[PDB]
Amino acid sequence: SKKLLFQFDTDATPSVFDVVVGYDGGADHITGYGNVTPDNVGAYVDGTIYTRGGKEKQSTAIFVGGGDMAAGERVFEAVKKRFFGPFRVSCMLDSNGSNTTAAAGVALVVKAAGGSVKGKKAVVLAGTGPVGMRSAALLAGEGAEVVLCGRKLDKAQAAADSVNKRFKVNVTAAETADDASRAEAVKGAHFVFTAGAIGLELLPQAAWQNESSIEIVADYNAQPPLGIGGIDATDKGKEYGGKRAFGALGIGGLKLKLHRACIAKLFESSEGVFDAEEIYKLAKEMAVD
Amino acid sequence: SKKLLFQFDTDATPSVFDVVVGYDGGADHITGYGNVTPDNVGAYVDGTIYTRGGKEKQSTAIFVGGGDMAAGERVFEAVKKRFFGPFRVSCMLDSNGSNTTAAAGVALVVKAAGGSVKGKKAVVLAGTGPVGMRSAALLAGEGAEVVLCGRKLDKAQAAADSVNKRFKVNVTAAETADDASRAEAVKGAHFVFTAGAIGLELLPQAAWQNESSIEIVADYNAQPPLGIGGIDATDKGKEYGGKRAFGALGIGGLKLKLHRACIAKLFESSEGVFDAEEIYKLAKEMAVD
Amino acid sequence: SKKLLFQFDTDATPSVFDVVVGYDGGADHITGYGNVTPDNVGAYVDGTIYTRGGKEKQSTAIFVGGGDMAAGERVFEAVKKRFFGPFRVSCMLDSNGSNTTAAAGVALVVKAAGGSVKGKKAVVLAGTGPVGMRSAALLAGEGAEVVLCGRKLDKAQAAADSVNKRFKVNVTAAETADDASRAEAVKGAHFVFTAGAIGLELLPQAAWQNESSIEIVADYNAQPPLGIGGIDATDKGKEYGGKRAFGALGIGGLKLKLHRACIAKLFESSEGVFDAEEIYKLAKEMAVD
Ligand SMILES: NC(=O)c1ccc[n+]([C@@H]2O[C@H](COP(=O)([O-])OP(=O)(O)OC[C@H]3O[C@@H](n4cnc5c(N)ncnc54)[C@H](OP(=O)(O)O)[C@@H]3O)[C@@H](O)[C@H]2O)c1
Ligand SMILES: NC(=O)c1ccc[n+]([C@@H]2O[C@H](COP(=O)([O-])OP(=O)(O)OC[C@H]3O[C@@H](n4cnc5c(N)ncnc54)[C@H](OP(=O)(O)O)[C@@H]3O)[C@@H](O)[C@H]2O)c1
Ligand SMILES: NC(=O)c1ccc[n+]([C@@H]2O[C@H](COP(=O)([O-])OP(=O)(O)OC[C@H]3O[C@@H](n4cnc5c(N)ncnc54)[C@H](OP(=O)(O)O)[C@@H]3O)[C@@H](O)[C@H]2O)c1
Ligand SMILES: [Li+]
Ligand SMILES: [Li+]
Ligand SMILES: [Li+]
Ligand SMILES: [Li+]
Ligand SMILES: [Li+]
Ligand SMILES: [Li+]
């Protein structure tokens, strides 16, 4: 049986990125939909549960994506709600790379910190997109005190409240409208993550290298100019004085390996669910080696 | 040459169901379009008739689908109108499973009735969707007196009039707004089909098991609660007193085999046309074995 | 690695034609987008440059199409603008077959004319679509005096001005509102190309066969009635008195071979750019044999 991946994207069109990685991860064919909503996804899922039986069921799987974390969560829940009994296929959520990237980045930082970040302070700059929101979630699950920042308080609050409802944690929000406010927000922090939109600097060199409390910084933006000044994108725990840095390509290598591995697993059973909990567990295992 | 199926769906997006079955039926690649109309389909068909020659022509084919039977018919006619001379590929119409499901269900019921339903009365409840409309068509072609019912008279009339124009038959329409009216409509019938939308009961157990005239009931809805009360979805002629029942999975197994077989045939010549007439002929042959 | 072609079409949906030829030309999978614009294409390109490394980069490529030449040019420039350093894949522009068809047709006519059309007069009737616009461009690059005609002066001027800006040439525009005006426009011409929309005659037999200056005529329309009266679609330099004619199928055979060859080349490196200049160079080489 051909391994068929159905890609349900909440954006207007399906992500190109997710298509390439789906093929490299083991799908035989990818069929993508945009504009997916909780209401229209049920009929799509029906197509995955009424077309194959027995051993063949596991050769169809579902991937949910898009650029709005909360919307992706709602579509993913609607997918799971449509299943019943043995009428199900494996499914994965990874809006904008949120789960796979955050899992890779947080796993790498936690490992570099010695295996625990409990009680330490983490600041996620521009944390209101999918990647920042999943980063905040995973850091809070590791027991860090997390501040999720954005240019406008209410959008940062909505992101933090979404994280707190989905993960039963207590991330706090802060408004950092400009460079000076972002530089103030990292003072006293132990860990800083930059999850800004592509091709933007959020944290200049002088805003982190002189802050004694900061132990590790991590940047997800791969397109120059990098999210963090004073680092290289390939950094993977590189030392800068007494601090360490992870750049977007250092994180991205693990994110890609993890994403590809999850795709393959979608076709190994008809019962898999790949979201933050499972993807982060796998990321920590992969970071060990 | 790769076997390329072009899926032209009248709905906003192409059916997932039809993608899976197309791959399992023998397509190498499926490319799907939504929002297809009689006006925009011609340029799509041009892409199928000007790109390959000779032996390679039969390796491209067209599948038309969607949720509106009349719209599917009009797109399918526009496909056939665009062809000329040897500039053609094989084509299939199966909006919402209408042809393949109705052919399977009617073939199974006709066989169970001894090979003829001529002169007997058939009632199609919720018969205004594609499946009910093709069921009514095939029953009328077998010489049954058919009543096509829906909640509102005018929509039922439009469905019956569409059937009668396409098939040159004389199906009649009836309004059955609620349970009590549906129960009245089956009185005196020999055959009852339920073609309601997914996950709805249309005919409770008490509304058919005490009607002496009813010989066979058939339900297309596979999602609980089933369209007919008092039966199991896997029933395939199971006896209930002096009556027999076909459930959605009993019908669906044949529908799937038939749909897959038609896909394979699309690539065996560049001249095939698969609609009710051909699909029902094949269904009756397949039901024999 | 699977050879993945990403098809970015400026029309509402991706061209079926371009899908078939992409598969026959060597793509393993084609994923198509409509409604592509210079603003939304960057994120699509990101998916092609951040997902594969090293030897695998060349196994992803981009194809830009659609029915508006100027729009295709702008999307293609936005694709190239998104690349940086080694972060790139091969790309091709062929809106509506413009480059591959014009290259085939012009290469065949130039060859039949003895290898040069410098200083001669070429008229492109209905030259405002992608095919006519690229034909005018290539003829002007060969040193012909080109008049690009359409039913309305301003649309013809916009097409000529687009050609002149992209190719640094000096095509002129003319209004030919009807048959009589088109017949007047070809008087004194040496070469006449008909690039009208499908299924339309633009140049009746009597409008070219009695014009002593005309040496070669070429018609791109394959659907009867042909763009030029008095010729056959398979003509490939067939003599009519002292003149020669190329019909749409004579041109189309080379266009198809050329288009397929370009697709294969997209996967031979991650640095290829296939637009008028490169495609015409290849067409002239292919026409030699
Ligand atoms: N390395 C990897 O493996 C990998 C994987 C996936 C994604 N990425 C990258 O990770 C980053 C985050 O991804 P994402 O999907 O969460 O991003 P996103 O949704 O595109 O943007 C994240 C946030 O950036 C902020 N922002 C936008 N424009 C800004 C500006 N001009 N100044 C300051 N802040 C601005 C916004 O927050 P506010 O409006 O609240 O201020 C926005 O919510 C992106 O660069 C993405 O490419 C990397
Ligand atoms: N077993 C198989 O092989 C197979 C294959 C294909 C499809 N199916 C199933 O067959 C059934 C019919 O398919 P279809 O495409 O024709 O269905 P559909 O178009 O989705 O719905 C059929 C009709 O159901 C009626 N309906 C909708 N909501 C209703 C309600 N609340 N109460 C009463 N009637 C209601 C409507 O008729 P009115 O508005 O006129 O009342 C509608 O036209 C579906 O359940 C589908 O999943 C089964
Ligand atoms: N043989 C091959 O290899 C090949 C390859 C690709 C395309 N084709 C064919 O080449 C032709 C040109 O392609 P294209 O994409 O450039 O075409 P197009 O954009 O669809 O149409 C070209 C022009 O035709 C004119 N036109 C439209 N309706 C007309 C009418 N009723 N009377 C007179 N003129 C009319 C319009 O010009 P104005 O509005 O300015 O008058 C329009 O811009 C088409 O027939 C296409 O199918 C052939
Ligand atoms: Li607020
Ligand atoms: Li900053
Ligand atoms: Li009426
Ligand atoms: Li009822
Ligand atoms: Li003008
Ligand atoms: Li004319």
mmCIF file with all atom_site columns, N, CA and C and ligand atoms in Angstrom, chain C residues 179 182 202-204, ligand 9:
data_model
loop_
_atom_site.group_PDB
_atom_site.id
_atom_site.type_symbol
_atom_site.label_atom_id
_atom_site.label_alt_id
_atom_site.label_comp_id
_atom_site.label_asym_id
_atom_site.label_entity_id
_atom_site.label_seq_id
_atom_site.pdbx_PDB_ins_code
_atom_site.Cartn_x
_atom_site.Cartn_y
_atom_site.Cartn_z
_atom_site.occupancy
_atom_site.B_iso_or_equiv
_atom_site.pdbx_formal_charge
_atom_site.auth_seq_id
_atom_site.auth_comp_id
_atom_site.auth_asym_id
_atom_site.auth_atom_id
_atom_site.pdbx_PDB_model_num
ATOM   1  N  N  . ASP C 1 179 ? -10.631 41.330 -38.688 1.00 0.00 ? 179 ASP C N  1
ATOM   2  C  CA . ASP C 1 179 ? -9.974  40.597 -39.766 1.00 0.00 ? 179 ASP C CA 1
ATOM   3  C  C  . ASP C 1 179 ? -9.312  41.550 -40.754 1.00 0.00 ? 179 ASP C C  1
ATOM   4  N  N  . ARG C 1 182 ? -6.133  43.042 -39.392 1.00 0.00 ? 182 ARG C N  1
ATOM   5  C  CA . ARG C 1 182 ? -5.063  42.050 -39.318 1.00 0.00 ? 182 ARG C CA 1
ATOM   6  C  C  . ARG C 1 182 ? -4.483  41.785 -40.703 1.00 0.00 ? 182 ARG C C  1
ATOM   7  N  N  . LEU C 1 202 ? -7.134  33.687 -36.917 1.00 0.00 ? 202 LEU C N  1
ATOM   8  C  CA . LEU C 1 202 ? -6.721  35.080 -36.990 1.00 0.00 ? 202 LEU C CA 1
ATOM   9  C  C  . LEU C 1 202 ? -6.319  35.539 -38.377 1.00 0.00 ? 202 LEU C C  1
ATOM   10 N  N  . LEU C 1 203 ? -5.886  34.625 -39.236 1.00 0.00 ? 203 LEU C N  1
ATOM   11 C  CA . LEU C 1 203 ? -5.301  34.991 -40.518 1.00 0.00 ? 203 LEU C CA 1
ATOM   12 C  C  . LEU C 1 203 ? -5.821  34.046 -41.583 1.00 0.00 ? 203 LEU C C  1
ATOM   13 N  N  . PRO C 1 204 ? -6.884  34.434 -42.277 1.00 0.00 ? 204 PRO C N  1
ATOM   14 C  CA . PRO C 1 204 ? -7.428  33.582 -43.331 1.00 0.00 ? 204 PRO C CA 1
ATOM   15 C  C  . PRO C 1 204 ? -6.427  33.352 -44.448 1.00 0.00 ? 204 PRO C C  1
HETATM 16 LI LI . LI  D 2 .   ? -8.099  37.982 -39.425 1.00 0.00 ? 9   LI  D LI 1
#
